[PDB]
Design a protein around this ligand. Sequence first.
Ligand code: A1B36
Ligand code: ZN
Length: 139
Amino acid sequence: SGAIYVGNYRVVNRHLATHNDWANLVWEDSSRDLLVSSTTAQGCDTIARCDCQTGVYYCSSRRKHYPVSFSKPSLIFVEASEYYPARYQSHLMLAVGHSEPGDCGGILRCQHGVVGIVSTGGNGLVGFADVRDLLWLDE
Ligand SMILES: CSc1ccc(Br)cc1CC(=O)N1CC[C@H](C(N)=O)C1
Ligand SMILES: [Zn+2]
């Protein structure tokens, strides 16, 4: 689990959104596994606006933050799970690292701020849903 809190927005994995996030929906995209809902309180996360390919992510299944190299956002085939059938997920970045289903939501950060959140994984890989292209999160 986990979320990004920027301005009056809450960014979570779409598959983990609560009935309350859907009522306060701003934007969602099943193909990106992202949902953004409105908040009453102002958030303090800064979103990165960069092309960094190295960063640090939080892995809740290890209670550890790991430095990683990750690929640029791309369209990647993602195996079936209890939340989606087998499909291509867009704006996804992969890294070699540990992840379990409940790690989704953990933040990936570079020197510029938040890059994205854990969204996919398994077999020694971890995938992150990029948020750096969502320029509107800043206004
Ligand atoms: C970090 S996700 C993960 C990790 C290890 C294993 Br094995 C399997 C997973 C995959 C997983 O459960 N999902 C849920 C939905 C998500 C998606 N974005 O399609 C992928
Ligand atoms: Zn950066």
